[PDB]
Design a protein around this motif. Structure first.
Motif, mmCIF file in Angstrom:
data_model
loop_
_atom_site.group_PDB
_atom_site.id
_atom_site.type_symbol
_atom_site.label_atom_id
_atom_site.label_comp_id
_atom_site.label_asym_id
_atom_site.label_seq_id
_atom_site.Cartn_x
_atom_site.Cartn_y
_atom_site.Cartn_z
ATOM 1 N N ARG A 376 -2.710 148.755 22.389
ATOM 2 C CA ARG A 376 -1.382 148.097 22.422
ATOM 3 C C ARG A 376 -0.456 148.899 23.358
ATOM 4 O O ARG A 376 0.245 148.325 24.223
ATOM 5 C CB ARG A 376 -0.759 148.038 21.013
ATOM 6 C CG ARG A 376 0.580 147.324 20.922
ATOM 7 C CD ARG A 376 0.989 147.187 19.464
ATOM 8 N NE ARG A 376 2.424 146.896 19.299
ATOM 9 C CZ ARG A 376 3.343 147.785 18.895
ATOM 10 N NH1 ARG A 376 3.001 149.029 18.581
ATOM 11 N NH2 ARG A 376 4.613 147.415 18.765
ATOM 12 N N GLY A 379 -0.847 148.675 26.896
ATOM 13 C CA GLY A 379 -0.412 147.411 27.462
ATOM 14 C C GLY A 379 -1.508 146.323 27.502
ATOM 15 O O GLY A 379 -1.334 145.313 28.194
ATOM 16 N N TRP A 380 -2.625 146.528 26.793
ATOM 17 C CA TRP A 380 -3.668 145.469 26.616
ATOM 18 C C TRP A 380 -3.100 144.264 25.857
ATOM 19 O O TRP A 380 -2.616 144.382 24.735
ATOM 20 C CB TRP A 380 -4.931 146.036 25.940
ATOM 21 C CG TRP A 380 -5.674 146.994 26.858
ATOM 22 C CD1 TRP A 380 -5.120 147.879 27.723
ATOM 23 C CD2 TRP A 380 -7.099 147.156 26.987
ATOM 24 N NE1 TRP A 380 -6.097 148.574 28.412
ATOM 25 C CE2 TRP A 380 -7.322 148.151 27.975
ATOM 26 C CE3 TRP A 380 -8.209 146.543 26.386
ATOM 27 C CZ2 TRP A 380 -8.603 148.527 28.386
ATOM 28 C CZ3 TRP A 380 -9.488 146.919 26.815
ATOM 29 C CH2 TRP A 380 -9.670 147.891 27.796
ATOM 30 N N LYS A 381 -3.104 143.113 26.485
ATOM 31 C CA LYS A 381 -2.405 142.016 25.873
ATOM 32 C C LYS A 381 -3.161 141.205 24.804
ATOM 33 O O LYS A 381 -2.517 140.545 24.003
ATOM 34 C CB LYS A 381 -1.792 141.112 26.945
ATOM 35 C CG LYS A 381 -0.630 141.811 27.644
ATOM 36 C CD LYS A 381 0.079 140.886 28.572
ATOM 37 C CE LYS A 381 -0.686 140.714 29.849
ATOM 38 N NZ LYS A 381 0.371 140.585 30.902
ATOM 39 N N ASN A 382 -4.493 141.256 24.784
ATOM 40 C CA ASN A 382 -5.275 140.389 23.889
ATOM 41 C C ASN A 382 -6.169 141.266 23.058
ATOM 42 O O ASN A 382 -7.392 141.348 23.288
ATOM 43 C CB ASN A 382 -6.134 139.405 24.688
ATOM 44 C CG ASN A 382 -5.430 138.919 25.968
ATOM 45 O OD1 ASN A 382 -4.462 138.169 25.851
ATOM 46 N ND2 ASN A 382 -5.892 139.400 27.212
#
Ligand code: NA
Length: 412
Positions: A376, A379-382
């Protein structure tokens, strides 16, 4: 003894050298050293904090050098505090690096620095203490905030000492038998209200083990707490800073009846078994095993109460630790999160990538919650956690299982 010639970043690049940021990871990650100050490190800088050195043996240092591909005569340019720069110079000299300089223009152009996209989610003790005393700080909570210690079962070590003003959460308030999956939305609503948490309360969690706090944190994110943060490295970083502690039973909390949004507000953050199984064998998705290597190959289940051995067939290995209660592959020597660059490369080699739908699992979800919160903050979105993990998977002897030593290719 002495340093070779000073290099600018530009010259260091021309000479195919590497920069070494010798500050604590918090600052390497993006936290400013003064209010409004430069945020992050120089492009592709490595992080070797001087404060780690007393917990790196000769062979740990050699390993770290090899692992970052420092060629022995290629220029190394250090930056940070003087004492730190000098402590690292000595150590790298003893390890046999031959071209050690300072990075002369380090941190001089704020617009070219690189940061953990959400470094503010991984706090450090001094930031937390400054917040408590009412000091203007970077990334200040927007409204109310709470500090909470998370641990398994009733308060123990917490009674001896804890961060001042910290409340306490027993992890049994968020997960339960039969599968050690999170409790129901309704039980979550009550848990939240009881600890005076609304959707816009900033919640800062820490534990004696990072993963207990992470477990709670991911579950609150799922429920709908917008701003949830971890103390990077847990309690030990607070203890070691010699900062104030309080003592005794947790003080009474003022209930907040109304959460202010319907729970769950972020249900996509938790996957059930079918959804997890759906990610397998894809380029645009990864189901990630945060289990030790002996768990991953089927030497051991990792747990007393799990009889079956082996791994989810097609799970990509995300690394973890030496056994089921350790997370060395995600930690610096002081217990904080390893660099985003290093984590990104470790995961990449197994085809785990930020553009994918990515879900982490382990035994029952604590280790995975930890890597979830890192992802998170990277910046990993999924990203999500597959709650049931190996415990639920191996309940059904119909689910495909892999055992044996194998590499990245074997999880296409
Ligand atoms: Na679980």
């Amino acid at each position: 003894a002495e340093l070779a010639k000073p290099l600018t970043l530009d010259q260091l690049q021309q000479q195919n050298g590497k920069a070494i940021d010798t500050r604590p990871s918090a600052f390497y990650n993006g936290w400013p050293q003064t209010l409004n100050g430069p945020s992050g490190h120089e492009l592709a800088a490595l992080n070797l904090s001087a404060s780690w050195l007393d917990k790196m043996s000769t062979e740990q240092l050699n390993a770290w050098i090899k692992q970052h591909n420092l060629k022995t005569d290629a220029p190394v340019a250090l930056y940070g505090n003087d004492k730190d720069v000098d402590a690292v110079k000595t150590r790298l000299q003893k390890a046999g690096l031959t071209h050690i300089s300072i990075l002369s223009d380090a941190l001089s152009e704020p617009s070219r620095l690189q940061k953990l996209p959400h470094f503010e989610q991984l706090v450090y003790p001094q930031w937390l203490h400054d917040l408590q005393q009412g000091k203007e700080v970077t990334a200040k909570p927007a409204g109310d905030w709470k500090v909470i210690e998370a641990a398994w079962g009733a308060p123990k070590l917490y009674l001896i000492s804890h961060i001042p003003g910290a409340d306490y959460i027993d992890t049994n308030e968020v997960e339960s038998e039969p599968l050690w999956n999170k409790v129901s939305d309704e039980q979550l609503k009550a848990m939240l209200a009881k600890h005076g948490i609304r959707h816009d309360t900033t919640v800062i969690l820490y534990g004696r083990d990072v993963y207990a706090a992470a477990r709670v944190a991911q579950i609150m994110l799922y429920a709908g707490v917008k701003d949830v943060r971890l103390l990077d490295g847990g309690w030990q970083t607070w203890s070691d800073a010699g900062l104030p502690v309080e003592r005794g039973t947790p003080p009474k909390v003022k209930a907040e009846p109304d959460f202010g949004v319907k729970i769950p507000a972020q249900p996509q953050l938790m996957l059930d078994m079918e959804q997890a199984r759906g990610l397998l064998h894809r380029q645009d998705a990864s189901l990630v095993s945060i289990r030790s290597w002996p768990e991953f190959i089927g030497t051991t289940s990792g747990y007393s109460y799990i009889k079956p051995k082996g791994e989810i067939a097609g799970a990509r290995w995300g690394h973890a630790g030496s056994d089921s209660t350790h997370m060395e592959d995600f930690h610096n020597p002081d217990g904080t999160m390893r660099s985003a660059d290093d984590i990104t490369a470790m995961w990449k080699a197994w085809n785990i990538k930020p553009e994918q739908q990515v879900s982490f699992y382990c035994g029952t979800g604590w280790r995975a919650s930890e890597t979830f919160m890192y992802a998170r903050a990277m910046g990993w979105k999924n990203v999500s956690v597959y709650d049931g993990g190996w415990y639920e998977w191996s309940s059904d002897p119909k689910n495909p299982v892999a055992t044996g030593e194998r590499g990245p290719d074997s999880s296409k």
